[PDB]
């Protein structure tokens, strides 16, 4: 069992990242005095890729600014001058026996300076309510760090269990994200209610935003 | 020069089989074991077999129960994985991947060096079908949209204006309803002075079910005219 801390890293560019791996089992080998641990480096849609074995031997092409160190049961991967495409997720992995085991990965991501997201709300369209069903979309753009709060209030009564979210990865220019809030209703059940809001907390906000509209305006 | 190409997986409903393959370029591909991993939700990173240079032994993740089966033709640059007996959990990315090691009385160790593109594997019972577009009309910044609901499998492509339109633009990974079918929406600011004069159009492409859609997004009418 590898287990990594932190789950997730925010870094600045050129500052350093370090990240751990603990092994619930000794991998140092008394006999060559080698650790039998690797890294790798996933990048957002690609696959893993080998960044350093022996503990602390990098690979053919990897840059000394990745710099793998421990020994027996604690490893750690730092990276120094942290590099935009560095923004990954990394993982340990053994080869101590012949199971190999990859710990559960650290993802490391760009720090800035927090940035309060643009909240908008839309209706459903006339189009959709034709068919019986009712989206209703709350967008929360360009914000950073990433946690957000969102809850739907529907003629002032929270709503739980009837909305779905999705956020964007980091984006690679502004390092911010935007995350989608959307509720689903019946026809029937949306035309049973007036007040439609989407409330927003985040750090870069004072107080929470309120977005809404009144059905039919 | 050097890699490996992935293909095969996609769909597969609950208990059915699957074939992986990968094809090998650019190294000597009788000089490596090869491996398969993968990656889900519920286990993570999960080596799941290896198969040694000659292809006449295998080794496999007992938490598999022998459902996975492994194999190579050496003479065609080709390693497979066929899935059986499929489950929910196998759901995820499925990588070949170059093993790098050694083998001693006690075993074989090695790292995994070089790896395919990644294919993803969804168990589902769910019937292909396209998705219902919808505008999210608009209203110094103005934000539009479309939404991209009930379809299935993945993946939807989205561009706007034919991929003119390229700044600004969010679209956001897609959502698993409780129905068995995905959504998602895709957005975009705009200066509001663009509004009505700018045209605005969502190109959606759901190639699994044959499924091309553009529409036009426009702000919302507030008059008896229109
Ligand atoms: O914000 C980061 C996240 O972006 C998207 O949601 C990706 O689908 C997810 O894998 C990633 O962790």
């Known amino acids: 069992l590898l287990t990594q801390s932190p789950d997730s890293l925010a870094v600045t560019l050129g500052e350093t990242a370090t990240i751990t791996c603990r092994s619930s089992r000794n991998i140092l080998h008394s006999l060559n005095n080698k650790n039998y641990l690797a890294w790798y480096q996933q990048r957002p849609g690609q696959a893993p890729k080998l960044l350093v074995i022996?503990?602390?031997m990098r690979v053919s092409g990897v840059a000394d600014r990745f710099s793998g160190s421990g020994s027996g049961t604690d490893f750690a991967l730092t990276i120094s001058s942290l590099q935009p495409e560095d923004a990954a997720v990394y993982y340990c992995q053994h080869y101590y026996t012949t199971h190999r085991t990859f710990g559960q990965g650290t993802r490391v991501e760009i720090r800035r300076t927090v940035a309060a997201p643009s909240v908008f709300i839309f209706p459903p369209s006339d189009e959709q309510l034709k068919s019986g069903t009712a989206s209703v979309v709350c967008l929360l753009n360009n914000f950073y760090p990433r946690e957000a709060k969102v809850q739907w209030k529907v003629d002032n009564a929270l709503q739980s269990g009837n909305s779905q979210e999705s956020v964007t990865e980091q984006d690679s220019k502004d390092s911010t994200y935007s995350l989608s809030s959307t509720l689903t209703l019946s026809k029937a059940d949306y035309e049973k209610h007036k007040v439609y809001a989407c409330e927003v907390t985040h750090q870069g906000l004072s107080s929470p935003v309120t977005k809404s509209f009144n059905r039919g305006e | 020069q050097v890699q490996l190409v992935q293909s095969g997986g996609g769909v597969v409903k609950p208990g059915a089989s699957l074939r992986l393959a990968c094809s090998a370029s650019?190294?000597?591909?009788?000089?490596?074991?090869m491996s398969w991993i993968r990656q889900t939700p519920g286990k993570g990173l999960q080596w799941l077999a290896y198969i040694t240079k000659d292809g006449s032994e295998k080794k496999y993740a007992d938490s598999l129960q022998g459902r996975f089966a492994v194999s190579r033709d050496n003479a065609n640059n080709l390693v497979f994985l066929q899935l059986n007996t499929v489950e929910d959990d196998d759901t995820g990315v499925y990588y070949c991947?170059?093993?790098?090691?050694?083998?001693?009385?006690?075993?074989?160790?090695?790292?995994?060096?070089?790896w395919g593109q990644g294919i993803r594997v969804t168990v589902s019972s769910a019937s292909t079908k396209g998705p219902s577009v919808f505008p999210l009309a608009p209203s110094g910044t103005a934000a539009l949209g479309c939404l991209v609901k009930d379809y299935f499998p993945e993946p939807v492509t989205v561009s706007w204006n034919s991929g003119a339109l390229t700044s600004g633009v969010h679209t956001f990974p897609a959502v698993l309803q409780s129905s068995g079918l995905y959504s998602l929406s895709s957005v975009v600011t705009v200066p509001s002075s663009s509004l009505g004069t700018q045209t605005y159009i969502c190109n959606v492409n759901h190639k699994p079910s044959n499924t091309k859609v553009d529409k036009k997004v426009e702000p919302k009418s507030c008059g008896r005219l229109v």
């Open positions: 650019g190294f000597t591909f009788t000089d490596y074991y």
């Open positions: 991947a170059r093993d790098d090691g050694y083998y001693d009385r006690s075993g074989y160790y090695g790292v995994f060096d070089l």
């Open positions: 022996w503990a602390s």
